[PDB]
Amino acid sequence: MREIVHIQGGQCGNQIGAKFWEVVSDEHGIDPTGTYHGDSDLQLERINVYFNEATGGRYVPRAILMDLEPGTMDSVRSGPYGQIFRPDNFVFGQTGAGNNWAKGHYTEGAELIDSVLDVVRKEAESCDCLQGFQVCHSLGGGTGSGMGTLLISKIREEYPDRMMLTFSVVPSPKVSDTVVEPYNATLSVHQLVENADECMVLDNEALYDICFRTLKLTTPTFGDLNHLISAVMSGITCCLRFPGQLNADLRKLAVNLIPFPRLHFFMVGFTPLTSRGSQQYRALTVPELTQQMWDAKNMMCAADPRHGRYLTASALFRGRMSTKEVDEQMLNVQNKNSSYFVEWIPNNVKSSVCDIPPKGLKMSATFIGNSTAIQEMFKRVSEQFTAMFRRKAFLHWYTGEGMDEMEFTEAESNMNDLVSEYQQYQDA
Amino acid sequence: MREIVHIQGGQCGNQIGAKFWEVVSDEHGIDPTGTYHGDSDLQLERINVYFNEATGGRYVPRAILMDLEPGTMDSVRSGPYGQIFRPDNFVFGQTGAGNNWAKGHYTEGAELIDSVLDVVRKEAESCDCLQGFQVCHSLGGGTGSGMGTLLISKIREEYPDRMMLTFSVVPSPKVSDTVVEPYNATLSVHQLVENADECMVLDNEALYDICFRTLKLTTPTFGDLNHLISAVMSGITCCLRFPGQLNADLRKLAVNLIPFPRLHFFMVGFTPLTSRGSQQYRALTVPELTQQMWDAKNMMCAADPRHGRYLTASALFRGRMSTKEVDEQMLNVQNKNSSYFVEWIPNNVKSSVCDIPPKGLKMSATFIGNSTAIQEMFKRVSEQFTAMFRRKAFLHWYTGEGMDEMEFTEAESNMNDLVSEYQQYQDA
Amino acid sequence: MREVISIHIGQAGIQVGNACWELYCLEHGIQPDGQMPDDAFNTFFSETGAGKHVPRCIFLDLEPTVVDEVRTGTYRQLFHPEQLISGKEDAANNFARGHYTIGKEIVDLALDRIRKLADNCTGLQGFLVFNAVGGGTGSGLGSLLLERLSVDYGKKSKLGFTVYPSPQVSTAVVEPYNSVLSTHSLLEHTDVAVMLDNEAIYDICRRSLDIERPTYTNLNRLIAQVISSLTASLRFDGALNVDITEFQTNLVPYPRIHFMLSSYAPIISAEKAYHEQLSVAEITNAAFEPASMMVKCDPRHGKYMACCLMYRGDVVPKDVNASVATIKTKRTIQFVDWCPTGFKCGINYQPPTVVPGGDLAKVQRAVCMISNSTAIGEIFSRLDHKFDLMYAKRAFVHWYVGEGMEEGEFSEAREDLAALEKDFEEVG
Amino acid sequence: MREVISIHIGQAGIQVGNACWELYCLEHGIQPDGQMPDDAFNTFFSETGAGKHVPRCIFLDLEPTVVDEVRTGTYRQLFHPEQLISGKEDAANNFARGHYTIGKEIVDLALDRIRKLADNCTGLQGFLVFNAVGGGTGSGLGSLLLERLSVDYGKKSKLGFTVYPSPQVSTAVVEPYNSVLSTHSLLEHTDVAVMLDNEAIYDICRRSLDIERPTYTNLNRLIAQVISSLTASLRFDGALNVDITEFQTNLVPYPRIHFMLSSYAPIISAEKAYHEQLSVAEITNAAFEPASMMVKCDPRHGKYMACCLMYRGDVVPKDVNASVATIKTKRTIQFVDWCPTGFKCGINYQPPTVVPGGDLAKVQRAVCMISNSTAIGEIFSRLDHKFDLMYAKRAFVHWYVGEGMEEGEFSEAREDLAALEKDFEEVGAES
Amino acid sequence: MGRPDGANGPAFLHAHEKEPKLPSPGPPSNPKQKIRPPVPAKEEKPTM
Ligand SMILES: Nc1nc2c(ncn2[C@@H]2O[C@H](COP(=O)(O)OP(=O)(O)OP(=O)(O)O)[C@@H](O)[C@H]2O)c(=O)[nH]1
Ligand SMILES: Nc1nc2c(ncn2[C@@H]2O[C@H](COP(=O)(O)OP(=O)(O)OP(=O)(O)O)[C@@H](O)[C@H]2O)c(=O)[nH]1
Ligand SMILES: Nc1nc2c(ncn2[C@@H]2O[C@H](COP(=O)(O)OP(=O)(O)O)[C@@H](O)[C@H]2O)c(=O)[nH]1
Ligand SMILES: Nc1nc2c(ncn2[C@@H]2O[C@H](COP(=O)(O)OP(=O)(O)O)[C@@H](O)[C@H]2O)c(=O)[nH]1
Ligand SMILES: [Mg+2]
Ligand SMILES: [Mg+2]
């Protein structure tokens, strides 16, 4: 009941998924052999939301690893938690995508869907009651963005009732991870506005401050950032897996969050995050979780919420606590700094709780914000796109795959409207 | 309840801020480890005015150390009591300040205000009911005098109702620890006339003689002068932290002290003060404390009471004593030398008292007086300012930071309007 | 013969089911394994052919994540496994889903239980609906269920204990909408509807209980103390045994006005009983105190149409008629002119039971008041504001219209509220 | 049955409350733990269902630092925790904060206690107010509270035992102002107003008790000996029983004139009581003595309009009427023409009780005098002088007006003293 | 929540920016309506 099927697209997706399935596995006390070795009966009761029973007491994940150039898969196929995956769920192409949204969506991606769909359905029907899909993308490259969206449009029509999530990692403002990044960005956005129920945005930049400011790290490697992203992807489905005195399914989290069908871009954070020195001073009380999650620093995206208004928000607390302190705090903020919250929504936060904190903590939280500052990711992208599409630079690669050019402008009008939707509703 | 928050801005602030927290930490029986090791329950009753309970039962200060060029902070980070501070409550910039009011107020200041304000509010909410702020300055320098007032101009606008004390160290009358002491004085004083509820004035000169004549010390290190400044700063909150047969909170001290919103420049002292030898000669009775506290030596500022008229005064006694004695004593003083006091105020003193003396003593006192001889310092400095500003010496340094000349004359006139306020009410 | 059917709908429906059914099992010595070591339990249970005392209730919900806790909790040998009804997918805080899509496919199952739950019933007092307005399951299923109960029995009485959305505390954003839609369906179908807000019961836990970490499990331990007091006459001897029909006749003047308030007294910590006598005189002054209401309504802005008082314990009628008489004279309490009477009083000799681990105190006198007042228009006009504030933009509508609903159901359910508030003014 | 409700406002209000309530728990054998090893106490307490006797008083203040002492000291199991009302921040010696800013949000919490406290007494004799005029809490809240007590209860008797600003000894600078503003609010709302100054009781500690180390813990121990001598007829059998209604009836000639002085006698150490006899005639002479007044005023500058007398101990009426007859012949003591009478005398067989570690002497005779004299117009004029001395410069005004006030409040409360001044010479008409 | 970055910039301080202003000496709103009647005028002489 209430199963979930999970997709990992691209190099980034095939690497965030490495830590995600490592984090969730430990939380349910299963070995890299796949055998359950936990203690409580609380791990087993909702284990089938991510895994499947197998002969011998194994628990194999319900993930789908898709990628061109399986080189990066050979890493995770060799890592410590690489022995758990089904080998038939590895779908890959022998050629490369070349950081090119076109061939990752038109030529090569189109050659794998016939096989990918036999994979997704084979484990979508084993679900006695499917809850939804969830993907992990990278809006910079070609494989993650291109094949990701093409996979979505096939998913959106085959399963329109169920809900698809998206932990899309978006480009960084101050540095360019690739050169053709703005082309792959918009052409993917133009697919997400229409074919996604919810979509969180992350940035490798903000993922550095939290390790440079909050965590006070020294050598933050991607192996650590993915331990951050995996902390929110685990923080969403707690109510699905663990009981709590105020549960929150995955669906009731959208209807309380998205007023209009196109503003489905969010902004996430996590709490508590302290150094290995400060854990001696700072205490763990709901007033602490509530201020650090609300701050303009734990926002894992590089968009300052203090430039717009909060339409709605959320909070998924974890750990046996007092349901009153939570309710009075989240209330105390809205009427405290009343200039950042819209007025035609009286109470614009939802609050969840769980009897089960993380594996090694006592209290924890997770934040989801739908702010009208998310438009700032789109302006900064809408300009870098129009500076180079203006002179038709790097386009012979995209048109070389038979692409048109109105698919570029349609990707810009669709965006340059989405930047206005976030302004009528922001009366400042 | 009645929580304070302490700011230490500058080289002086960061250094006397060390001795201050060294005294209070002893007064409440806590070790530099941060653990409590006192005897009475009375220590833990009002500890929350200065500290924050932590995990495992620790008490860490609620100070804020802000200073450019963290060099002097690397010292207090390495002193004996350097383990108590939260490392997060350290604000420093990689650039020098140059003993220059401009860059400490315009260029370098503006780059750290985002952090300092994000720091002060992390704890201005940790208070169930905030009483007021409390700072330490060095008016000659650039960090303490530029960032100091800049932070104040911010503090006054988000928390106007609350109170902010200021133990500002003023320039010396005869020696000048800096060649640009005037410009840093007036430009700061002008900020203190508009954005300060109370402002003591302490001078390094008077601190020497008191350490030479009265204390008979041979080599007075700055560690000794701050064992004095710490003594009086602790002497103000004894009604807050400890019981008293006539308590006196911080607010009822200003209301009872400043007749007009501008005359908030006070004058302090501490008693008793004896050499190691004379301890065996003079008794410790209330008539003793009041004889030395009213003297013209214990005035930590270099302003002579016998030149002006006391508008008001104060006294905070500490010890199981007889509250008749204090009342008849302070009455006799006004009675005998009845020309040093104005006449349109019948009784112009307050007299607190506390059941709890310092940790090593049995009876102590503490003095605060708002005289009209304080106009002399602003006369001595308003002459040195207009001396070199008339020829524009060292001005190319200030104007290089986007300053102007109106920001000078405004500062001077606003000071000259203050020196007249202290002359009308001096009817000789 | 004196029996009722106790329905629980939603999460808070079964959240209070765990408090109520932990009371009756304890109030009658019923072990969690059914059996105990007549008509004292026949109100709530049904002795089988041998020993076992199964309850007569029904836990209904859509998320198994809570109904399964009952299946694994200590009360798993108690319930008939078919009573604990549950679903696969949830309403997702969306009135439409709980009414049009998912509601229609399990009511046919729930109804069969009631038919098999009423045949053994020989004389049925009335149904008992524990509902939580504000969620899809609470508002949608509850609405769809009540209409089915009206057309089956009609002559049987439905009592609605519906948690209502509070002014400040709000665990959702769209809870205004589905709270409005509930009225058009509950009003014509419930015989009488009690109200109570999660916020008002929070402050009760602050002043009286002095419990600083309140939780949903705390409040439910108060509601169970109401129904225990409400149905004491049904199962415990006592002067002036008050049935349901009697209770209902002299409280509801018009077929519309059946929205009433509640109270309880004394509510005290187990130690302040050592500082009080809690006489019949003292308690009934506290039942009419505005701070002792279980809803954030102010009865001093309105008038009373009736009251009902259910006393418990060592109470004799000579003191009831005395304390009631000194209240009609009090000026603050205003009774609408067309009822010079207004009190139906009930006495029991069975004092209120206390649960181990509870917060209340063992007392010998207790009062539960249930008043029908015209001040109830307050809490009912706030909803008329938030609904008209968000519906001006059609926010969150595309969720309701996408689940087999329309735009008329919004304006229709809106007029019904205006049609109701006039009725709370025609009685002036 | 014969039940009164005691209030304590501000610091001095509760610092005398710790003295009176240390006396009653001792005067009825009430252990600090509520219980003891009818109607002898029912004036001040109320049995619960479990042994204890809880006092029917209210400690109200805006400073936690003085209320928590009660919560930690030996007298913490006594009070119902709800009666000890406190506040987050204080009034900061400002009449505005006690009247417009802070006082407005806690009164409802106080009144809900008074209402819960009124029903528990079957017959309410009257309220007792222990005020401290000169601060923010004592004057600002006492002002605001006394009004609300008049609306909810009306003509019920509210006494006032309010320490007044002393001429010389003064621990404040702004206490002129918040004293003046208080007058109108007490005048129109309190029924009777006894007055006493911190200085006047200092000299009495000097000469009589001979304690050269006097503090507030000494003065508060004196006021306890007054009220116990005043409310003995409420809870102790004795000839010529006198209640509160009988008290104000034949003591307050006009609705305005309700200020009066106090005098206790004898006041003697534990050793001079052996160099002494303390006859009823000697005591009552030391009672009318000006030096034994509890206010720094002079009775030989004005005229006695009425006097009350609460005797205590081995006293018989034949001796009261005899000594009083002498004073009526004494020329030093004047009396306004229109009272050939002028004494309402009370007797109580129960002598005063001594507190262990106290400074008075165990005596079987005592006298507590309260006289409504017109000489009290003196202590009422010094305030008129100092107030105008400062108010001619608008000094300290920006505080008052900066907290929800204007300037008119000064002139009203100023004239209310001016009008009240002439009344203290009008009644001395002598025509 | 604080202010967005770059908006806490220092501003110019004029002379007497923060200076309270006495409104005026003016008759107050409510004299509070004394309840007790005045003292008679020592010349009523009701006795006959
Ligand atoms: N007094 C009390 N109120 C509760 C409790 N649990 C939830 N509530 C309130 O019930 C409201 C939501 O009702 P739910 O039952 O959780 O939601 P639902 O009716 O099941 O509909 P779905 O969430 O879509 O399944 C919230 O406002 C809660 O504050 C509880 O245990 N005690
Ligand atoms: N007889 C007596 N007088 C006291 C005592 N304590 C204070 N006073 C006097 O009360 C007057 C000041 O009023 P306080 O009660 O101390 O302060 P407040 O009225 O509560 O106003 P805030 O300080 O704002 O709380 C002074 O004249 C004190 O001398 C005491 O214990 N006994
Ligand atoms: N958090 C995280 N982000 C990564 C990591 N590796 C790459 N990314 C981002 O992924 C982007 C490039 O997309 P990529 O996945 O390499 O191309 P694709 O194979 O076509 O999807 C770049 O913006 C990288 O910064 C990683 O290891 N951890
Ligand atoms: N009481 C005391 N005063 C000091 C001490 N050190 C410096 N001061 C004063 O600090 C003044 C200079 O300001 P400073 O804070 O050192 O430089 P800034 O960082 O630019 O403000 C000088 O007048 C010093 O006398 C000290 O150790 N103890
Ligand atoms: Mg629900
Ligand atoms: Mg006070």
PDB file of N, CA, C and O in Angstrom, chain A residues 2 46 128 245 247 249 252 255-256 258-259 322-324 327 331 343-344 347 350, chain C residues 11 63 68 88 90 92-93 168 170-173 206 214-215 389-390 396 398-399:
ATOM      1  N   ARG A   2       0.513   2.214  -0.859  1.00  0.00           N
ATOM      2  CA  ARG A   2       1.171   3.522  -0.899  1.00  0.00           C
ATOM      3  C   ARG A   2       2.640   3.397  -1.295  1.00  0.00           C
ATOM      4  O   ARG A   2       3.526   3.949  -0.642  1.00  0.00           O
ATOM      5  N   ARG A  46       6.437  -0.418   7.139  1.00  0.00           N
ATOM      6  CA  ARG A  46       6.352   0.415   5.945  1.00  0.00           C
ATOM      7  C   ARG A  46       7.623   0.317   5.112  1.00  0.00           C
ATOM      8  O   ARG A  46       8.100   1.305   4.554  1.00  0.00           O
ATOM      9  N   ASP A 128       0.678  -2.610  -5.124  1.00  0.00           N
ATOM     10  CA  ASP A 128      -0.751  -2.819  -4.922  1.00  0.00           C
ATOM     11  C   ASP A 128      -1.504  -1.496  -4.895  1.00  0.00           C
ATOM     12  O   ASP A 128      -2.695  -1.452  -5.217  1.00  0.00           O
ATOM     13  N   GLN A 245       1.749  11.832  15.130  1.00  0.00           N
ATOM     14  CA  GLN A 245       0.475  12.338  15.616  1.00  0.00           C
ATOM     15  C   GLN A 245      -0.146  13.369  14.687  1.00  0.00           C
ATOM     16  O   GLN A 245      -1.262  13.821  14.954  1.00  0.00           O
ATOM     17  N   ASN A 247       0.120  13.104  10.573  1.00  0.00           N
ATOM     18  CA  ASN A 247       0.761  12.606   9.370  1.00  0.00           C
ATOM     19  C   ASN A 247       0.501  13.548   8.201  1.00  0.00           C
ATOM     20  O   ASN A 247      -0.422  14.367   8.218  1.00  0.00           O
ATOM     21  N   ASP A 249       0.664  12.866   4.033  1.00  0.00           N
ATOM     22  CA  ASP A 249       0.947  12.137   2.811  1.00  0.00           C
ATOM     23  C   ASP A 249       1.630  13.059   1.800  1.00  0.00           C
ATOM     24  O   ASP A 249       1.717  14.275   1.977  1.00  0.00           O
ATOM     25  N   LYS A 252      -1.216  15.512   0.022  1.00  0.00           N
ATOM     26  CA  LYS A 252      -1.746  16.613   0.812  1.00  0.00           C
ATOM     27  C   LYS A 252      -0.684  17.678   1.039  1.00  0.00           C
ATOM     28  O   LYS A 252      -0.967  18.729   1.618  1.00  0.00           O
ATOM     29  N   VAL A 255      -1.530  20.163  -2.385  1.00  0.00           N
ATOM     30  CA  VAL A 255      -2.778  20.911  -2.314  1.00  0.00           C
ATOM     31  C   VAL A 255      -2.709  22.021  -1.281  1.00  0.00           C
ATOM     32  O   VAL A 255      -3.433  23.013  -1.394  1.00  0.00           O
ATOM     33  N   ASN A 256      -1.858  21.881  -0.271  1.00  0.00           N
ATOM     34  CA  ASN A 256      -1.643  22.933   0.710  1.00  0.00           C
ATOM     35  C   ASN A 256      -0.533  23.891   0.310  1.00  0.00           C
ATOM     36  O   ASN A 256      -0.210  24.795   1.084  1.00  0.00           O
ATOM     37  N   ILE A 258       0.487  24.659  -3.502  1.00  0.00           N
ATOM     38  CA  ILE A 258       0.466  25.211  -4.853  1.00  0.00           C
ATOM     39  C   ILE A 258      -0.897  25.864  -5.075  1.00  0.00           C
ATOM     40  O   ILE A 258      -1.880  25.145  -5.312  1.00  0.00           O
ATOM     41  N   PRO A 259      -1.002  27.184  -5.027  1.00  0.00           N
ATOM     42  CA  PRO A 259      -2.296  27.824  -5.282  1.00  0.00           C
ATOM     43  C   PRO A 259      -2.722  27.718  -6.738  1.00  0.00           C
ATOM     44  O   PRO A 259      -3.889  27.438  -7.027  1.00  0.00           O
ATOM     45  N   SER A 322       6.277  18.334  21.393  1.00  0.00           N
ATOM     46  CA  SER A 322       4.999  18.908  21.793  1.00  0.00           C
ATOM     47  C   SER A 322       4.365  19.580  20.587  1.00  0.00           C
ATOM     48  O   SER A 322       4.914  20.549  20.055  1.00  0.00           O
ATOM     49  N   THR A 323       3.207  19.072  20.164  1.00  0.00           N
ATOM     50  CA  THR A 323       2.530  19.595  18.986  1.00  0.00           C
ATOM     51  C   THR A 323       2.051  21.028  19.177  1.00  0.00           C
ATOM     52  O   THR A 323       1.694  21.684  18.195  1.00  0.00           O
ATOM     53  N   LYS A 324       2.073  21.547  20.402  1.00  0.00           N
ATOM     54  CA  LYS A 324       1.663  22.929  20.605  1.00  0.00           C
ATOM     55  C   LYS A 324       2.803  23.894  20.323  1.00  0.00           C
ATOM     56  O   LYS A 324       2.595  24.927  19.679  1.00  0.00           O
ATOM     57  N   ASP A 327       2.982  24.560  16.725  1.00  0.00           N
ATOM     58  CA  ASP A 327       1.916  25.373  16.150  1.00  0.00           C
ATOM     59  C   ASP A 327       2.047  26.835  16.545  1.00  0.00           C
ATOM     60  O   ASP A 327       1.779  27.725  15.730  1.00  0.00           O
ATOM     61  N   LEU A 331       3.156  29.935  13.814  1.00  0.00           N
ATOM     62  CA  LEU A 331       2.260  31.082  13.860  1.00  0.00           C
ATOM     63  C   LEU A 331       2.997  32.340  14.283  1.00  0.00           C
ATOM     64  O   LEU A 331       2.788  33.410  13.702  1.00  0.00           O
ATOM     65  N   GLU A 343      -1.089  38.437   2.085  1.00  0.00           N
ATOM     66  CA  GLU A 343      -2.221  38.797   2.929  1.00  0.00           C
ATOM     67  C   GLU A 343      -3.497  38.055   2.566  1.00  0.00           C
ATOM     68  O   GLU A 343      -4.295  37.744   3.453  1.00  0.00           O
ATOM     69  N   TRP A 344      -3.714  37.753   1.288  1.00  0.00           N
ATOM     70  CA  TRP A 344      -4.913  37.032   0.895  1.00  0.00           C
ATOM     71  C   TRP A 344      -4.819  35.543   1.180  1.00  0.00           C
ATOM     72  O   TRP A 344      -5.603  34.762   0.634  1.00  0.00           O
ATOM     73  N   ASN A 347      -3.461  31.937   6.976  1.00  0.00           N
ATOM     74  CA  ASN A 347      -2.453  31.060   7.563  1.00  0.00           C
ATOM     75  C   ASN A 347      -1.859  30.234   6.435  1.00  0.00           C
ATOM     76  O   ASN A 347      -2.560  29.423   5.823  1.00  0.00           O
ATOM     77  N   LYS A 350       1.807  24.661   6.626  1.00  0.00           N
ATOM     78  CA  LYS A 350       1.362  23.371   7.117  1.00  0.00           C
ATOM     79  C   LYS A 350       2.450  22.794   8.010  1.00  0.00           C
ATOM     80  O   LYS A 350       3.635  23.078   7.828  1.00  0.00           O
TER      81      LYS A 350
ATOM     82  N   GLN C  11      -8.618  11.476  11.251  1.00  0.00           N
ATOM     83  CA  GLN C  11      -7.539  11.198  12.191  1.00  0.00           C
ATOM     84  C   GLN C  11      -7.929  11.609  13.602  1.00  0.00           C
ATOM     85  O   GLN C  11      -7.948  10.783  14.517  1.00  0.00           O
ATOM     86  N   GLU C  63      -6.158   6.548   5.592  1.00  0.00           N
ATOM     87  CA  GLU C  63      -4.760   6.164   5.721  1.00  0.00           C
ATOM     88  C   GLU C  63      -4.653   5.016   6.705  1.00  0.00           C
ATOM     89  O   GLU C  63      -5.089   5.165   7.857  1.00  0.00           O
ATOM     90  N   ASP C  68      -3.745   1.020  11.770  1.00  0.00           N
ATOM     91  CA  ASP C  68      -2.923  -0.154  12.034  1.00  0.00           C
ATOM     92  C   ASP C  68      -2.258  -0.067  13.400  1.00  0.00           C
ATOM     93  O   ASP C  68      -1.975  -1.101  14.014  1.00  0.00           O
ATOM     94  N   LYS C  88      -7.038   2.705   1.183  1.00  0.00           N
ATOM     95  CA  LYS C  88      -5.738   2.603   0.532  1.00  0.00           C
ATOM     96  C   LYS C  88      -5.112   3.974   0.297  1.00  0.00           C
ATOM     97  O   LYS C  88      -3.982   4.227   0.723  1.00  0.00           O
ATOM     98  N   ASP C  90      -5.647   8.342   0.542  1.00  0.00           N
ATOM     99  CA  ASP C  90      -6.267   9.261   1.483  1.00  0.00           C
ATOM    100  C   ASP C  90      -6.918  10.449   0.785  1.00  0.00           C
ATOM    101  O   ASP C  90      -6.745  10.681  -0.412  1.00  0.00           O
ATOM    102  N   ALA C  92      -6.316  13.608   1.328  1.00  0.00           N
ATOM    103  CA  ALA C  92      -5.318  14.629   1.016  1.00  0.00           C
ATOM    104  C   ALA C  92      -5.863  16.039   1.234  1.00  0.00           C
ATOM    105  O   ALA C  92      -5.718  16.918   0.385  1.00  0.00           O
ATOM    106  N   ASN C  93      -6.487  16.244   2.393  1.00  0.00           N
ATOM    107  CA  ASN C  93      -6.994  17.550   2.821  1.00  0.00           C
ATOM    108  C   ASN C  93      -7.743  18.256   1.697  1.00  0.00           C
ATOM    109  O   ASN C  93      -7.550  19.442   1.432  1.00  0.00           O
ATOM    110  N   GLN C 168      -6.273  31.233  15.520  1.00  0.00           N
ATOM    111  CA  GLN C 168      -4.825  31.312  15.374  1.00  0.00           C
ATOM    112  C   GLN C 168      -4.220  29.983  14.929  1.00  0.00           C
ATOM    113  O   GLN C 168      -3.588  29.907  13.871  1.00  0.00           O
ATOM    114  N   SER C 170      -3.704  26.778  13.128  1.00  0.00           N
ATOM    115  CA  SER C 170      -4.228  26.216  11.887  1.00  0.00           C
ATOM    116  C   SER C 170      -3.153  25.326  11.285  1.00  0.00           C
ATOM    117  O   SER C 170      -2.147  25.825  10.777  1.00  0.00           O
ATOM    118  N   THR C 171      -3.369  24.015  11.336  1.00  0.00           N
ATOM    119  CA  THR C 171      -2.415  23.052  10.805  1.00  0.00           C
ATOM    120  C   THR C 171      -2.548  22.860   9.308  1.00  0.00           C
ATOM    121  O   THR C 171      -2.060  21.856   8.780  1.00  0.00           O
ATOM    122  N   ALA C 172      -3.196  23.789   8.614  1.00  0.00           N
ATOM    123  CA  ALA C 172      -3.382  23.678   7.175  1.00  0.00           C
ATOM    124  C   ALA C 172      -3.680  25.061   6.623  1.00  0.00           C
ATOM    125  O   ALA C 172      -3.868  26.024   7.367  1.00  0.00           O
ATOM    126  N   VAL C 173      -3.721  25.146   5.298  1.00  0.00           N
ATOM    127  CA  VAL C 173      -3.984  26.392   4.602  1.00  0.00           C
ATOM    128  C   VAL C 173      -5.365  26.396   3.961  1.00  0.00           C
ATOM    129  O   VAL C 173      -6.049  27.420   3.965  1.00  0.00           O
ATOM    130  N   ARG C 206      -2.655  25.541  29.969  1.00  0.00           N
ATOM    131  CA  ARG C 206      -1.636  26.465  30.452  1.00  0.00           C
ATOM    132  C   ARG C 206      -1.958  26.992  31.845  1.00  0.00           C
ATOM    133  O   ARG C 206      -1.171  26.803  32.776  1.00  0.00           O
ATOM    134  N   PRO C 214       2.166  20.595  25.890  1.00  0.00           N
ATOM    135  CA  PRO C 214       0.919  19.912  25.555  1.00  0.00           C
ATOM    136  C   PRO C 214       0.999  19.263  24.183  1.00  0.00           C
ATOM    137  O   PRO C 214       1.799  19.635  23.325  1.00  0.00           O
ATOM    138  N   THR C 215       0.156  18.255  24.003  1.00  0.00           N
ATOM    139  CA  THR C 215       0.189  17.419  22.818  1.00  0.00           C
ATOM    140  C   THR C 215      -1.227  16.917  22.589  1.00  0.00           C
ATOM    141  O   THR C 215      -2.079  16.986  23.477  1.00  0.00           O
ATOM    142  N   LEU C 389     -11.731  35.860   1.682  1.00  0.00           N
ATOM    143  CA  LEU C 389     -10.450  36.493   1.395  1.00  0.00           C
ATOM    144  C   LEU C 389      -9.632  35.702   0.384  1.00  0.00           C
ATOM    145  O   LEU C 389      -8.976  36.297  -0.475  1.00  0.00           O
ATOM    146  N   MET C 390      -9.664  34.374   0.464  1.00  0.00           N
ATOM    147  CA  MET C 390      -8.936  33.507  -0.452  1.00  0.00           C
ATOM    148  C   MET C 390      -9.723  33.189  -1.716  1.00  0.00           C
ATOM    149  O   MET C 390      -9.144  33.167  -2.805  1.00  0.00           O
ATOM    150  N   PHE C 396      -6.393  27.632  -4.957  1.00  0.00           N
ATOM    151  CA  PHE C 396      -6.561  26.220  -4.627  1.00  0.00           C
ATOM    152  C   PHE C 396      -7.837  25.620  -5.197  1.00  0.00           C
ATOM    153  O   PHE C 396      -8.204  24.500  -4.829  1.00  0.00           O
ATOM    154  N   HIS C 398      -8.484  24.767  -8.407  1.00  0.00           N
ATOM    155  CA  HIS C 398      -8.228  23.756  -9.424  1.00  0.00           C
ATOM    156  C   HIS C 398      -8.035  22.364  -8.842  1.00  0.00           C
ATOM    157  O   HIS C 398      -8.073  21.387  -9.597  1.00  0.00           O
ATOM    158  N   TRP C 399      -7.836  22.245  -7.530  1.00  0.00           N
ATOM    159  CA  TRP C 399      -7.826  20.929  -6.906  1.00  0.00           C
ATOM    160  C   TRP C 399      -9.242  20.423  -6.687  1.00  0.00           C
ATOM    161  O   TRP C 399      -9.538  19.252  -6.944  1.00  0.00           O
TER     162      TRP C 399
END
